Symmetry: C2
Subunit: 232 residues, 2 copies
Amino acid sequence: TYAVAFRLERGLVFAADTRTNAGVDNIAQYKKLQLWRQPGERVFVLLSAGNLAATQAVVSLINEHLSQETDDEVTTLFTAPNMYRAARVVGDAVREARSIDNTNFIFGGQIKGERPRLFQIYPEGNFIEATDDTPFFQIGEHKYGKPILDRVARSDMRLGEAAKLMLLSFDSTLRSNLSVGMPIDLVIYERDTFDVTREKRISADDEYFRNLSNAWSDALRQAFSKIEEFDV
Amino acid sequence: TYAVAFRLERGLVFAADTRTNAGVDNIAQYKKLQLWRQPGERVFVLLSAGNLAATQAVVSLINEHLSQETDDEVTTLFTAPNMYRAARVVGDAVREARSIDGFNTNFIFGGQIKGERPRLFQIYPEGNFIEATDDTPFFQIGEHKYGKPILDRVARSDMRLGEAAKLMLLSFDSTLRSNLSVGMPIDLVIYERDTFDVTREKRISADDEYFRNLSNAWSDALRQAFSKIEEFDV
């Protein structure tokens, strides 16, 4: 399990792998990048990590509260005024699941009236917003991929440029840890569009990611061979 | 807390940071690399991660048993026939630490005794251990996660001792930037095969010229390599 998302000037980008520790012994493929949309008004993307039962409980409880009543009983994703209050709908859904009987999320999107805003939800219920200083979040097996993010990330990056960095974060994680595994569900979002046309599943057979990994490997192999060792 | 060691054809390489935590609030420098010597006969090196009180308890018990030499049938580091037995002597000291009195000791013990080749091990909290092979020529303890990718990319069993040392310092470079628990200085030790003495030993300080040149050169190489990557667009 590993997911990453960026907050930029041009908009938001999201990414998450599919491999999970579902069974006690077995491992299975499950899509973690959830999506909600009302074209014109608003867009939401929810990346998820941790326990799959508790993850799917929060996703199911969000979809239940939307579809149950036309009459406004409580604040839902579509009925919330701004993204801070939209994050609270996800936060209360985590509290609801724990009440009913280690889930970390990355909730992000945009509502008309304000800019795109990215958040990270903790297991307790509370959350934090992304800023230009630290323009991304991670959940699940984050430590393998963080080194390259800390070096080259920037809030002024382009949307496709951040997708290189985010996918290179997976490339480090995939070789080391076997908990993370392809395919990867990536979703780019442009500012003030309110529509999720830009989306792709990147499988193991994919040739862009093959060229990405080999070109990056060659660069690190070439750069490492030039490093002097006579001074130690 | 982070340490790493390589087993190669030409010998062994050991490296470990100094930054630990004494209490919940306090943090300070403590050297993790310990070594015992009997020039000509045998050499040992012990990297030590986890709890400091438990770490020092194992190091103290090993030094204590060495200091006895009085009517003893127990096996020490200097009295053990081969390195597997020498590794289990360190394992017995971990078991003795648990008995005497949370607990999460984790070591990388390696070296050579005359008669056989250099052998590298990783000691676990409970007492048992595993040996390094040609397939997996290194071990890690403490904050291993950040520096593991660069090791997995270019680590080989047939590398040079200096080639491993520069790779291990790049593993630190990735960890140091992305985590504050791991911190400089770093203590490097290179052991050559069948030399039976730790001649090559160096502390890499925070203001070291080689490491800052290594880090900035590597940082530029990664940024230059990133700009030549193809644009994702869909």
